[PDB]
């Protein structure tokens, strides 16, 4: 049956939940809890029952009766890459994808796999070549998450991938400019993704290892601080500068590199920033200057009706970079 499902992001820094509902969709509830250490390791859920208890807190905090959910795998658990295949009937395409994907997957095809055509299949004939985006994950990564959700009393309807789910609240705005080339960066705590689009159609995705944790770890090193305290220092201050400079330089290089490899193999007018790592003070200006792309924060909540009597627009805005993904997952939960 046709359920309105919740959006949940099992983030490495924060576990975040969003409830949306109604026919034009409206925000109903949201909640965030810091992720306890040891629960996630390198994209896997190492402590699923402990995650289940954390996710229960979220459902209590949001005060929701909903028990269906869309969530997402960590970017470190999924391989995302495009693959050229001839158009065939759907069951036949699956086998072709699985066959082609086999070469790019550093473990036994034990894998869960999905794909989606980068261009509409109806616009080409049988046998012509189409680019599909393939996603692949270890069955174990998927199993850790489903076991977590089961302990929490939740039923998953979709297991999505963050670089695209983060885009759902921007999609109507990206469709306004169907021919414009846009970049969207999600700087997380565990990874940074980049997605390059034309209008609302992805052209490429790249995931970098470098992220908010790296900035915390450099502050930590530079001042023998604990992670939480280095983290708090990162938030309030943003000399800090001297400790985080090599991270800034390295992130800037890695992002110039990715863009140069996009331009070689396939280039951004404007861009958007999401993810809490994008709020480091001044980062947006730095990245604008250094990548030659006007990069802006953006408010994901505009995708949804927000009741001024229940939420402060000012507060929503502040947490919009961290919540873009959970909001996209909640939008998916109420599709179509």
């Amino acid at each position: 049956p046709r359920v309105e499902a919740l959006g949940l992001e099992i983030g490495a820094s924060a576990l975040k939940l969003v409830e949306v509902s109604g026919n034009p969709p409206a925000l109903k509830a949201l909640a965030s809890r810091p992720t306890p250490p040891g629960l996630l390791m390198e994209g896997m859920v190492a402590e699923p029952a402990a995650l289940a208890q954390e996710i229960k807190e979220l459902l209590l905090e949001a005060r929701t009766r909903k028990r269906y959910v869309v969530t997402a795998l960590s970017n470190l658990a999924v391989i995302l890459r495009p693959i050229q295949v001839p158009k065939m009937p759907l069951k036949e395409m699956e086998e072709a994808v699985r066959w082609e994907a086999e070469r790019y997957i550093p473990f036994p095809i034990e894998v869960v796999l999905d794909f989606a055509p980068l261009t509409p299949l109806s616009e080409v004939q049988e046998g012509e070549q189409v680019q599909v985006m393939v996603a692949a994950a270890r069955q174990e990564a998927v199993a850790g998450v489903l076991e977590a959700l089961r302990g929490a009393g939740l039923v998953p309807v979709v297991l999505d991938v963050k670089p695209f789910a983060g885009l759902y609240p921007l999609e109507a705005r990206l469709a306004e400019e169907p021919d414009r080339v846009f970049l969207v960066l999600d700087i997380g705590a565990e990874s940074t993704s980049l997605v390059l689009l034309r209008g609302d159609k992805p052209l490429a995705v790249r995931v970098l290892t470098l992220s908010g944790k790296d900035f915390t770890e450099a502050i930590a090193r530079s001042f023998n601080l604990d992670l939480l305290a280095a983290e708090e220092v990162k938030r309030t201050y943003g000399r800090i500068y001297d400790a985080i400079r090599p991270v800034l330089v390295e992130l800037t290089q890695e992002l110039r590199r990715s863009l140069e490899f996009f331009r070689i193999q396939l280039s951004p007018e404007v861009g958007y920033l999401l993810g809490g790592g994008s709020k480091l003070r001044g980062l947006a200006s730095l990245l604008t200057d250094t990548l030659g792309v006007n990069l802006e924060p953006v408010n994901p909540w505009e995708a949804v009706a927000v009741d001024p009597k229940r939420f402060e627009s000012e507060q929503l805005q502040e947490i919009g970079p961290e919540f873009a993904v959970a909001l996209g997952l909640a939008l998916r939960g109420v599709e179509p």
């Binding site: 989606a116 980068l118 069955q139 998927v142 999609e171």
Partner: peptide, 8 residues
């Protein structure tokens, strides 16, 4: 826009 699902 791309909508994947890696649910088994």
């Amino acid at each position: 826009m791309i909508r994947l699902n890696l649910l088994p």
